[PDB]
Coordinates of C-alpha atoms and ligand atoms in Angstrom, one line a residue:
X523 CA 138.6 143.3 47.8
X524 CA 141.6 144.1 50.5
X525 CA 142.7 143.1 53.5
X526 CA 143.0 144.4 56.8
X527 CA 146.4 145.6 56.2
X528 CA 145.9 147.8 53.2
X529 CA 147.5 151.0 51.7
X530 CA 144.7 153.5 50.8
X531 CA 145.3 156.4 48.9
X532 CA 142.9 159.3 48.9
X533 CA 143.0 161.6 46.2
X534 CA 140.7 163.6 43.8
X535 CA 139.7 162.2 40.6
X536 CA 137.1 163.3 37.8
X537 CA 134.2 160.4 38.1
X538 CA 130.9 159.8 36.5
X539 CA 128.9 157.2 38.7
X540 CA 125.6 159.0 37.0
X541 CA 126.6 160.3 33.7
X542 CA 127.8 163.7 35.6
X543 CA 131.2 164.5 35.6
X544 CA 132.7 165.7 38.6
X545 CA 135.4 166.0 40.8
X546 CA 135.2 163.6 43.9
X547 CA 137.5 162.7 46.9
X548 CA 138.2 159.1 46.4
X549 CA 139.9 156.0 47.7
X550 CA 141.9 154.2 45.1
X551 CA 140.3 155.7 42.3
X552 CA 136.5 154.4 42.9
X553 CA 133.3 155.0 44.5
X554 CA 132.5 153.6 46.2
X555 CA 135.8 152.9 48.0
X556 CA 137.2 149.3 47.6
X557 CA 135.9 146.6 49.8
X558 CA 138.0 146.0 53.2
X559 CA 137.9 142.3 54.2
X560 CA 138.8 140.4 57.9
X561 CA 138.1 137.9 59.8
X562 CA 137.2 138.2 63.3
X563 CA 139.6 138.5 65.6
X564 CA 142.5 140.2 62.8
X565 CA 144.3 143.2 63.3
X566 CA 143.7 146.0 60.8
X567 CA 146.6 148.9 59.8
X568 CA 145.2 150.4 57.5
X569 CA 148.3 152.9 56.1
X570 CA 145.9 156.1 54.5
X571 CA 147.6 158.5 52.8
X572 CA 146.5 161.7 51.6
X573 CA 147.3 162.8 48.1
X574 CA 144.3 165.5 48.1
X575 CA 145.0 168.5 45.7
X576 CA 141.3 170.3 44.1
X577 CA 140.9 173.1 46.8
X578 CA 137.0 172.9 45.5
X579 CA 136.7 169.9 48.4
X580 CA 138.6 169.9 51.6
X581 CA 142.3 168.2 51.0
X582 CA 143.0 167.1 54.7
X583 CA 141.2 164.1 55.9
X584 CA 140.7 161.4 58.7
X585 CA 138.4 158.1 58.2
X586 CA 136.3 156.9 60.5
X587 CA 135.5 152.6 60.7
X588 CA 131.8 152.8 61.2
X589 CA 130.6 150.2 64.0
X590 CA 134.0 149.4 64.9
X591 CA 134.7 149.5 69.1
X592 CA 138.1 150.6 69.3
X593 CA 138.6 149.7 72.6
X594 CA 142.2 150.3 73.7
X595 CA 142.9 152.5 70.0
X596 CA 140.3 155.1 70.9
X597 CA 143.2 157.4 69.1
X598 CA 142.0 155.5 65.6
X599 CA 138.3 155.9 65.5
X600 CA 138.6 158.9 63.2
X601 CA 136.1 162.1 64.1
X602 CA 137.8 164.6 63.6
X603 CA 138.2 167.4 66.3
X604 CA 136.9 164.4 68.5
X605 CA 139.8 161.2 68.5
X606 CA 142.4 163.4 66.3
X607 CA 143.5 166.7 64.0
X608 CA 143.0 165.6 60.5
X609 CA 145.5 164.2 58.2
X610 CA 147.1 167.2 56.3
X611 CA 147.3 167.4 52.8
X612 CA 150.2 165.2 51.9
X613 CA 150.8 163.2 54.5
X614 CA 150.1 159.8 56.2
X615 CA 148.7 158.1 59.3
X616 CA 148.7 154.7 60.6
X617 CA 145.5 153.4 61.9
X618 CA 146.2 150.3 63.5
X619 CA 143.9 148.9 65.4
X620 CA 142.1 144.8 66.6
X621 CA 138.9 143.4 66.4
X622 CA 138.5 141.0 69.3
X623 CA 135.3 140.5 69.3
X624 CA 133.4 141.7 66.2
X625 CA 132.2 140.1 62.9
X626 CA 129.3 141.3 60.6
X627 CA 128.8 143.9 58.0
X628 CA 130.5 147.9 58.5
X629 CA 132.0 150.2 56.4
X630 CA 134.3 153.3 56.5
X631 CA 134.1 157.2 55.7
X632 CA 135.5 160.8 55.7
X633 CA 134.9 162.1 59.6
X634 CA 136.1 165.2 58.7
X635 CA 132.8 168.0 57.7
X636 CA 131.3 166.8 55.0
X637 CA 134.1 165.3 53.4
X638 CA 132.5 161.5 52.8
X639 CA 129.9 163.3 50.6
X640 CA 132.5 164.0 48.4
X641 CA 133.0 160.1 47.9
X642 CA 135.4 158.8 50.9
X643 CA 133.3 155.8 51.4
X644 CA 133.2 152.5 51.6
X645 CA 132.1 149.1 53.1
X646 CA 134.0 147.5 54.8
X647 CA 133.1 143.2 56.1
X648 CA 134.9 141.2 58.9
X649 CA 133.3 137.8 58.2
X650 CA 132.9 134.9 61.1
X651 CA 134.7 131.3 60.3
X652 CA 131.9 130.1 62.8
X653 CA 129.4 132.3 61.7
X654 CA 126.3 130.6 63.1
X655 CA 124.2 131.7 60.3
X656 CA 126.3 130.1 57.8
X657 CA 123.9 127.3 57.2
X658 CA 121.6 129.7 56.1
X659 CA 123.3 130.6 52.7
X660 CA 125.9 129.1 50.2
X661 CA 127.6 132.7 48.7
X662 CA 128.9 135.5 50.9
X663 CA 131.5 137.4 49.3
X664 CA 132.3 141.2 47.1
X665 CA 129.6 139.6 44.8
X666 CA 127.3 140.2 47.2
X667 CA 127.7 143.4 48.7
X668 CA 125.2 146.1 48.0
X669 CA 125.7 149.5 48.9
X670 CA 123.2 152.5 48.7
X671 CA 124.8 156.0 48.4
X672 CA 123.1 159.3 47.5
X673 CA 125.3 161.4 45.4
X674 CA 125.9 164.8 44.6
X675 CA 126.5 166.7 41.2
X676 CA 128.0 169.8 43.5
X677 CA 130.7 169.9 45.5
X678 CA 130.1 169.5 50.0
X679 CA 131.6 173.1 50.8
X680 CA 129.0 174.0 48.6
X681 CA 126.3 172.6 49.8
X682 CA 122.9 175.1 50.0
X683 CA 121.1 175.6 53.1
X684 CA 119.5 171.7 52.8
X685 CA 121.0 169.5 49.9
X686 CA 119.0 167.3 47.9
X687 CA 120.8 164.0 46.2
X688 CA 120.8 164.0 42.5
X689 CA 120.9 160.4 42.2
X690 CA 120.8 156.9 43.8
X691 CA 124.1 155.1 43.6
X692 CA 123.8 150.9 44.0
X693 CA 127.5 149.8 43.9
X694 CA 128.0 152.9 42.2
X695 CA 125.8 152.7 39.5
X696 CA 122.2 155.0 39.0
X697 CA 120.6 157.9 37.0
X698 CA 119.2 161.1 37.7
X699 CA 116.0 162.5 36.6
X700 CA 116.9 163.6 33.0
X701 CA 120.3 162.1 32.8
X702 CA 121.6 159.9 30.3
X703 CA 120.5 156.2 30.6
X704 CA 123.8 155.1 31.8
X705 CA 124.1 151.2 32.7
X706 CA 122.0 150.2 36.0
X707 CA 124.3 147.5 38.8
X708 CA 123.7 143.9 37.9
X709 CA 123.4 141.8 40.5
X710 CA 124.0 138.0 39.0
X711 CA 122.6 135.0 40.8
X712 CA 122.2 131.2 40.3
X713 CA 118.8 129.8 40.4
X714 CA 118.8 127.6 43.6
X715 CA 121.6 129.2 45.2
X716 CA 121.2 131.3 48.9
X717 CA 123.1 134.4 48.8
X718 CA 124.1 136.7 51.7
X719 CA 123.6 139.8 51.2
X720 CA 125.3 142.7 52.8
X721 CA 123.4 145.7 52.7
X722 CA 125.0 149.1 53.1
X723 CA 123.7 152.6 53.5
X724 CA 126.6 154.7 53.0
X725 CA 123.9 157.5 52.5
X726 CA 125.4 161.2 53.4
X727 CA 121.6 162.0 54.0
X728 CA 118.3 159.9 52.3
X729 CA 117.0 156.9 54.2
X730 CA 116.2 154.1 51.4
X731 CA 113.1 151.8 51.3
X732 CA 114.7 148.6 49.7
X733 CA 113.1 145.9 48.4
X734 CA 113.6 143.1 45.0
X735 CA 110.6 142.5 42.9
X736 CA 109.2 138.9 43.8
X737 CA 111.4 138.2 46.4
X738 CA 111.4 138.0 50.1
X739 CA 114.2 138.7 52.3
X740 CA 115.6 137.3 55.7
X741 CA 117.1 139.3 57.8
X742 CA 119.9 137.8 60.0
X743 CA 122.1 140.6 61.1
X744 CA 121.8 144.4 62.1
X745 CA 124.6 146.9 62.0
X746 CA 127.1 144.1 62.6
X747 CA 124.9 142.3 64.7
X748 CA 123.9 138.4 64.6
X749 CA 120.0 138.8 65.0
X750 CA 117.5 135.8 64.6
X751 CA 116.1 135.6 61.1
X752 CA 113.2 137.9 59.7
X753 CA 111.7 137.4 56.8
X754 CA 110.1 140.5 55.3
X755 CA 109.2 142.0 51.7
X756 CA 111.0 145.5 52.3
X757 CA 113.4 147.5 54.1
X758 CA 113.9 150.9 55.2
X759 CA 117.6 151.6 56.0
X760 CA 118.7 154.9 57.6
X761 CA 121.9 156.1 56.6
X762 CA 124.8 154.5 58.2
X763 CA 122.5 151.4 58.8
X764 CA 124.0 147.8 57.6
X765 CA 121.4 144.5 57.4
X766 CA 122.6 141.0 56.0
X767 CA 119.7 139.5 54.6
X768 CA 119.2 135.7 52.8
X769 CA 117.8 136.1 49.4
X770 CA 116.7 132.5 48.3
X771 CA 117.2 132.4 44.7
X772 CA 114.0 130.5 43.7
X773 CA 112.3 132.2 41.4
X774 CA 112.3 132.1 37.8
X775 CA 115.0 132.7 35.7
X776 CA 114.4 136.1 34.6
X777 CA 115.8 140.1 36.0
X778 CA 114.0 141.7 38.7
X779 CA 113.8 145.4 39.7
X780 CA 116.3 145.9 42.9
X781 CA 114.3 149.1 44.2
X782 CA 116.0 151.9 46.3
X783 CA 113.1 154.7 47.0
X784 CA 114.9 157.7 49.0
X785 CA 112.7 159.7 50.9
X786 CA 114.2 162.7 49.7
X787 CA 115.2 163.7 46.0
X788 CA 113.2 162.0 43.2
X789 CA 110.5 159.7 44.8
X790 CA 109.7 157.6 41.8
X791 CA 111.5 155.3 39.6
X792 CA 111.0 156.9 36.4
X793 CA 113.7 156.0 33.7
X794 CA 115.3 154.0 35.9
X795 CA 116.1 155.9 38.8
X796 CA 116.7 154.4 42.3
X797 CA 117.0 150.9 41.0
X798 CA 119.2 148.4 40.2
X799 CA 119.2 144.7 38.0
X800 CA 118.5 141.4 40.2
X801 CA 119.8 138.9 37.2
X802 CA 119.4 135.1 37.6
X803 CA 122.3 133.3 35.3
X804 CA 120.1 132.7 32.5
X805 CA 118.1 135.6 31.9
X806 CA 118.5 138.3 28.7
X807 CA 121.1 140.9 29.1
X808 CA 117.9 143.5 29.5
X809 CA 116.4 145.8 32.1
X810 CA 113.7 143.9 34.0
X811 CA 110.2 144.2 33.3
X812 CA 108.7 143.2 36.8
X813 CA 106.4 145.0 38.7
X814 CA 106.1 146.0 42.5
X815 CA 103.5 144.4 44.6
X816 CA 102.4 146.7 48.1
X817 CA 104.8 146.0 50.8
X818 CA 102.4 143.7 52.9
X819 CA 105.3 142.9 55.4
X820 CA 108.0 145.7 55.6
X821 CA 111.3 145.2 58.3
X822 CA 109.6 147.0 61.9
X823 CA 112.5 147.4 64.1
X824 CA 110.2 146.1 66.7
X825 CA 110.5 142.6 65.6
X826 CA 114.0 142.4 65.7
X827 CA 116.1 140.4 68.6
X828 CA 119.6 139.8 68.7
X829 CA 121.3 136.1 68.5
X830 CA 123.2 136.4 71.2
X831 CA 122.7 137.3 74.7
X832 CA 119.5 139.3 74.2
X833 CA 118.3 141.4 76.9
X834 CA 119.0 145.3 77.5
X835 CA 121.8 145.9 80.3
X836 CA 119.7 147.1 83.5
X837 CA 117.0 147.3 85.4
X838 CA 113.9 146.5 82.9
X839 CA 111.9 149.7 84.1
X840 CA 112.1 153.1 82.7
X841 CA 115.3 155.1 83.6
X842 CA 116.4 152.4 85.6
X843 CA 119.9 152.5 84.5
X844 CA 122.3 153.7 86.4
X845 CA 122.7 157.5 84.4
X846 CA 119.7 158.7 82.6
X847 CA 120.3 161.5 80.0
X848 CA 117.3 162.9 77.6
X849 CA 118.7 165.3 74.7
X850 CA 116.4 168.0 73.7
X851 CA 116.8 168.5 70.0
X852 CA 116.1 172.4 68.2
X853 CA 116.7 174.0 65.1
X854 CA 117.6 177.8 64.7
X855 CA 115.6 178.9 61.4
X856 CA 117.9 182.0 61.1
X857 CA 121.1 180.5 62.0
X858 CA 120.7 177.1 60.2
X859 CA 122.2 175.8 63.4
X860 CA 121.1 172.3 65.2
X861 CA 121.2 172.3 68.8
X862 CA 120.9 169.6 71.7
X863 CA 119.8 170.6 74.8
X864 CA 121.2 174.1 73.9
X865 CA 124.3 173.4 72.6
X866 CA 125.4 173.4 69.0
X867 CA 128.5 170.7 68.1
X868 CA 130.8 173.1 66.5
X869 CA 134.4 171.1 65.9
X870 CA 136.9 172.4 68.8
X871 CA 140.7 173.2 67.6
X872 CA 142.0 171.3 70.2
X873 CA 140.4 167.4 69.9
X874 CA 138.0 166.2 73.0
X875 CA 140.8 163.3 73.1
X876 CA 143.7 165.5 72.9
X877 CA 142.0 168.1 75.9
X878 CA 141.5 164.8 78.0
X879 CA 145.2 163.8 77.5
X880 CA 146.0 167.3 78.4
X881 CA 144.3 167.1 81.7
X882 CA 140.9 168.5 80.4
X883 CA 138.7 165.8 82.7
X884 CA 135.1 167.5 83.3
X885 CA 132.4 168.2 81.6
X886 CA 133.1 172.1 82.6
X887 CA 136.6 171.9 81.5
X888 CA 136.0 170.3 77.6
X889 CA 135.6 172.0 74.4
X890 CA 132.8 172.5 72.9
X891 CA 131.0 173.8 76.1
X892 CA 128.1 171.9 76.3
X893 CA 128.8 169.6 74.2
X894 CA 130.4 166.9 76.2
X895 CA 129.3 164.8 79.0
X896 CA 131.5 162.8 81.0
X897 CA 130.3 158.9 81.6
X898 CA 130.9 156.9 84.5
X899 CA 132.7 153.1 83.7
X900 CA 131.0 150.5 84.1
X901 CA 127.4 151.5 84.3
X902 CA 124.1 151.3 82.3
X903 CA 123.5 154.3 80.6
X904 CA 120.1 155.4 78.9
X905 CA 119.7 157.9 76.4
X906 CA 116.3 158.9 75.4
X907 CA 116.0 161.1 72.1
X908 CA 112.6 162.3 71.4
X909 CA 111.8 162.9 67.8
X910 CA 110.2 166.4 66.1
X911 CA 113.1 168.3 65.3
X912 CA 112.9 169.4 61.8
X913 CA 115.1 167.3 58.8
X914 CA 113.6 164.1 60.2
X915 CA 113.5 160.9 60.5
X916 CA 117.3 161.9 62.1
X917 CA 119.4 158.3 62.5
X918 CA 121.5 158.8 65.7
X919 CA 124.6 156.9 65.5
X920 CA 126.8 155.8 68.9
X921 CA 130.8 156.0 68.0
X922 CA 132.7 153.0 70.5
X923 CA 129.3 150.9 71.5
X924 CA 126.7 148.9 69.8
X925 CA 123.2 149.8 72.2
X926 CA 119.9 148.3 72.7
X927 CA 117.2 149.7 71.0
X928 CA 114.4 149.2 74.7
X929 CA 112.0 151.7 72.4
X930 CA 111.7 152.3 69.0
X931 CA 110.3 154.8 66.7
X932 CA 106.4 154.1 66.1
X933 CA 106.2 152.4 69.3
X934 CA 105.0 153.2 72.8
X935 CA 106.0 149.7 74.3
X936 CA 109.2 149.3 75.8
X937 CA 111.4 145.7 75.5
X938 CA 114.1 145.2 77.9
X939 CA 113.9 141.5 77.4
X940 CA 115.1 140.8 73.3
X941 CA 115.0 144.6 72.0
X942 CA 117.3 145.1 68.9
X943 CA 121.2 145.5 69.5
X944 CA 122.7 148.1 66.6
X945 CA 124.5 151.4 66.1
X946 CA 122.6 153.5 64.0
X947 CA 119.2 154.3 64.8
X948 CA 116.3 156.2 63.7
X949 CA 114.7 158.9 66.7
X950 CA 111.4 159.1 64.3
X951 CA 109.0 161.8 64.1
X952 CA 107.0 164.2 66.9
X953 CA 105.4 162.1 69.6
X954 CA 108.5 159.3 69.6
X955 CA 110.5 158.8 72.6
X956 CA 113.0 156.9 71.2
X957 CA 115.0 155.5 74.1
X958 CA 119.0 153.5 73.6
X959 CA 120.5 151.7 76.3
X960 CA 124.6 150.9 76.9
X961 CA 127.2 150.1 79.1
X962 CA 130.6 151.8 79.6
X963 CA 132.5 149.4 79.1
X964 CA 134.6 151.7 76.9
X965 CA 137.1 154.9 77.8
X966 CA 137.2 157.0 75.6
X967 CA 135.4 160.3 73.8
X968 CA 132.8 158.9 71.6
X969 CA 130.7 160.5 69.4
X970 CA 126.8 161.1 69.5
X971 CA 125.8 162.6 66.3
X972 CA 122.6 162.6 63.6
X973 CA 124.3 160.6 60.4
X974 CA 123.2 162.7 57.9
X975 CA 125.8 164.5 57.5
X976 CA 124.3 167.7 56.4
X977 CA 123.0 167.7 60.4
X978 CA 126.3 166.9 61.7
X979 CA 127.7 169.8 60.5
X980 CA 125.1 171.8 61.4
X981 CA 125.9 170.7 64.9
X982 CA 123.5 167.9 65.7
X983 CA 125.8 166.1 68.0
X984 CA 127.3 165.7 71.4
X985 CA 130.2 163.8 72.7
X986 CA 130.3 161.1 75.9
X987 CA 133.9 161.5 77.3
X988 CA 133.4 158.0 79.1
X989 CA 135.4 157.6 81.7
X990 CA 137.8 161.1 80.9
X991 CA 140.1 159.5 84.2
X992 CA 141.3 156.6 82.9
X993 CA 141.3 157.7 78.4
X994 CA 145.0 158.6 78.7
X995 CA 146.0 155.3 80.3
X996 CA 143.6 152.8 78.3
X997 CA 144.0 155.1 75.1
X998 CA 147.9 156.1 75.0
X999 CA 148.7 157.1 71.3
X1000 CA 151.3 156.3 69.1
X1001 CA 153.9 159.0 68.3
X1002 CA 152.2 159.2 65.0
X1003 CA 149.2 160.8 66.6
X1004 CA 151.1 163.0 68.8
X1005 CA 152.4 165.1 65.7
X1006 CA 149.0 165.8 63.8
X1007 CA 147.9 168.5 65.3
X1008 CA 151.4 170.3 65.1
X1009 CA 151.3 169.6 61.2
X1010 CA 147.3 170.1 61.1
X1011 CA 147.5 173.9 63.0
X1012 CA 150.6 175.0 61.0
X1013 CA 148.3 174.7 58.1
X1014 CA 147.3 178.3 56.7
X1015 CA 143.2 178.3 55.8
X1016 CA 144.5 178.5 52.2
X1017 CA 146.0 175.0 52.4
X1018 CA 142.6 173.2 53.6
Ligands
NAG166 C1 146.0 152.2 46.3 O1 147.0 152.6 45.3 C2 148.3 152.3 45.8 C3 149.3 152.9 44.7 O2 149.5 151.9 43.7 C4 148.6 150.9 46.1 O3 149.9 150.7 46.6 C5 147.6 150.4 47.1 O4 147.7 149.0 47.4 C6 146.2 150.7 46.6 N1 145.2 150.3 47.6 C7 144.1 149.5 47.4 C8 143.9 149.1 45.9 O5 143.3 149.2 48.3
NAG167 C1 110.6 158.6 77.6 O1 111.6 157.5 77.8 C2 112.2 157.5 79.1 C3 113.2 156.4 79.1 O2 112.5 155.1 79.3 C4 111.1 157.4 80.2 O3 111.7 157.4 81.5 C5 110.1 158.5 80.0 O4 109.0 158.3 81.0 C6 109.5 158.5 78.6 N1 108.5 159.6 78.5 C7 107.4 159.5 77.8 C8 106.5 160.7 77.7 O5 107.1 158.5 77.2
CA168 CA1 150.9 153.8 48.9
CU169 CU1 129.4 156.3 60.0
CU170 CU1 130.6 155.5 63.8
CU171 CU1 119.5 164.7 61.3
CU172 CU1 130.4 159.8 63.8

């Protein structure tokens, strides 16, 4: 693990997480990327520097802190085209930023195309000295991060028309169907001991239905979020999703199948795909032997209530917020584009903050047209999303905010008094009105986007210039920031 001041170099190198060998865009030499550690309240400059060379993946980059407000640093959240030009190909930038007021489980990635595909990625914890679930558990630490990652034999420029992963990664470790039998991640735990365990999708595109043979798990926080424990048998985790949950280490002393099911790709676990070793000190140095019993009790978003100061911001009746904004989602079978209400995201060559700083301050005015929608401060805002579009279930993820969740996918019933408070969130099939809640309590250009990433570049997204007026004062870059576009538009296509 590393700190929040931390020198990350990103740069290709020739990896084999699944037996494969190929070329990946990395951070420090690993996939996934090394562990970033905090404590609430700390400071993070986090010094990235850009060695990229294999002209098969892009070579310029910017990293995006996945959860992370930003409020006052707007100019370090990391979309590219959106808060900045992206980091050219030997060169550095400085993202310094605070947490104030944030503690739980995030992680970081690529913002630039597809780029974080190619293996930028990583999690990323800022852990709470007075955590109030702390009596819940006795280990929290890199032992007990897990993340989930799809990967990719192929580079992302590459990709075909819809990609399909070729394995399951569980802190870096899985198979593919008819790949060598490589070793699965070990998880090691002491019998009697409560671990914390900090779940990450860094998924470019599957959503994973976890769950640990003959074990329970209790969920206590969502997408950096303290919520009030819920115990359940299995979890489906879009990508970009984080849950800690308590695993109580009571059960015999033997290894247990850690299960990842994608719901894309290779939908079994045959030879030992999607899965990963739950050990208990103790046990033979084996691959388990344990069985799956039916999921009588999987995570429902539903069921979910946040810690502190539940309740959705508002009036609790249907589009009783102050602005009220329903995106239309559509797909273009001959263009392969994504659209929402019309509009297809494509990246603009000046960035949404860069337009705003240059006195672009309406929605008429800023690039992408159609695009962006300019927020009001300090109002409720509800989004609704309705589900259908195909590529589905598509997790929408809101950059600067965390929202309440007042309808979820599968549901009809609205909660305005304890719905769920995250950042990622599944819209859910045809017939879902899935339906967020915020306030703008935030200046800046923020991202709206499908998290697979696949989608993204298609153009599934929008962006919310809250409050354009006041983004140059709240938001006023470093120098630093000032010169990447100059460097970033010199570049000649040949050099990306
Ligand atoms: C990445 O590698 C550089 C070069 O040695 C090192 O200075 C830096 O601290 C590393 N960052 C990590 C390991 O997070
Ligand atoms: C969809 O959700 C919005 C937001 O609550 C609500 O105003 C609208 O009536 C809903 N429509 C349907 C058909 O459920
Ligand atoms: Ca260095
Ligand atoms: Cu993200
Ligand atoms: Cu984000
Ligand atoms: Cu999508
Ligand atoms: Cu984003």
């Amino acid at each position: 693990a590393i700190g929040p001041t931390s020198d990350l170099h990103i740069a290709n190198k020739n990896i084999s997480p699944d037996g494969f060998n190929r070329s990946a865009v990395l951070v420090n030499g690993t996939f996934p990327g090394p562990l970033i550690t905090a404590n609430k309240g700390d400071n993070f400059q986090i010094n990235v520097i850009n060695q990229l060379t294999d002209p098969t993946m892009l070579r310029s980059t910017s990293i995006h802190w996945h959860g992370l407000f930003q409020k006052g640093t707007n100019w370090a959240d990391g979309p590219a085209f959106v808060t900045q030009c992206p980091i050219a190909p030997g060169h550095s930038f400085l993202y310094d930023f605070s947490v104030p007021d944030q503690a739980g489980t995030f992680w970081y990635h690529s913002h630039l195309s597809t780029q974080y595909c190619d293996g930028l990625r990583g999690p990323l914890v800022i852990y709470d000295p007075n955590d109030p679930h702390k009596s819940l558990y006795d280990v929290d630490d890199e032992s007990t991060i897990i993340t989930l990652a799809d990967w990719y034999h192929t580079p992302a420029p590459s990709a075909q028309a819809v990609p399909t992963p070729d394995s399951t990664l569980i802190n870096g470790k899985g198979r593919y169907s008819g790949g060598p039998t490589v070793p699965l991640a070990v998880i090691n735990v002491e019998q009697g001991k409560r671990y914390r365990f900090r779940l990450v999708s860094i998924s470019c595109d599957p959503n994973f239905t976890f769950s640990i043979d003959g074990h329970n798990l209790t969920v206590i926080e969502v997408d950096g979020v303290n919520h009030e424990p819920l115990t359940v048998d299995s979890i489906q985790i879009f990508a970009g999703q984080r849950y800690s949950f308590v695993l109580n280490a009571n059960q015999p002393v033997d290894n247990y199948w850690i299960r990842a099911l994608p719901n894309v790709g290779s939908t079994n676990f045959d030879g030992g795909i999607n899965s990963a070793i739950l050990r208990y000190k103790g046990a033979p140095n084996a691959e388990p032997t344990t069985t799956q019993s039916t999921s009588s009790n999987p995570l429902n978003e539903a069921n979910l209530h946040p810690l502190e100061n539940p309740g959705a911001p508002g009036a609790p009746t249907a589009g009783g917020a102050d602005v009220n904004i329903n995106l239309a989602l559509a797909f273009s079978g001959t263009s392969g584009k994504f659209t929402i209400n019309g509009a297809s995201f494509t990246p603009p060559t000046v960035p949404v903050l860069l337009q705003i700083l240059s006195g672009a301050q309406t929605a008429q005015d800023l690039l992408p047209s159609g695009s962006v929608y300019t927020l009001p401060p300090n109002k409720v805002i509800e989004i609704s999303i309705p589900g259908g579009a195909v590529g589905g279930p598509h997790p929408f993820h809101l950059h600067g905010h965390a929202f309440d969740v007042v309808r979820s996918a599968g549901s009809s019933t609205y909660n305005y008094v304890n719905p769920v408070r995250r950042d990622v969130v599944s819209i859910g099939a045809a017939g879902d009105n899935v339906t967020i809640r915020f306030t703008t309590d935030n200046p800046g250009p923020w991202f709206l986007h499908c998290h697979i990433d696949w989608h993204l570049e298609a153009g599934l997204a929008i962006v919310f210039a809250e409050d354009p007026a006041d983004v140059a004062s709240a938001n006023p870059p470093p120098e630093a920031w000032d010169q990447l576009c100059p460097i970033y538009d010199a570049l000649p296509p040949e050099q990306l």
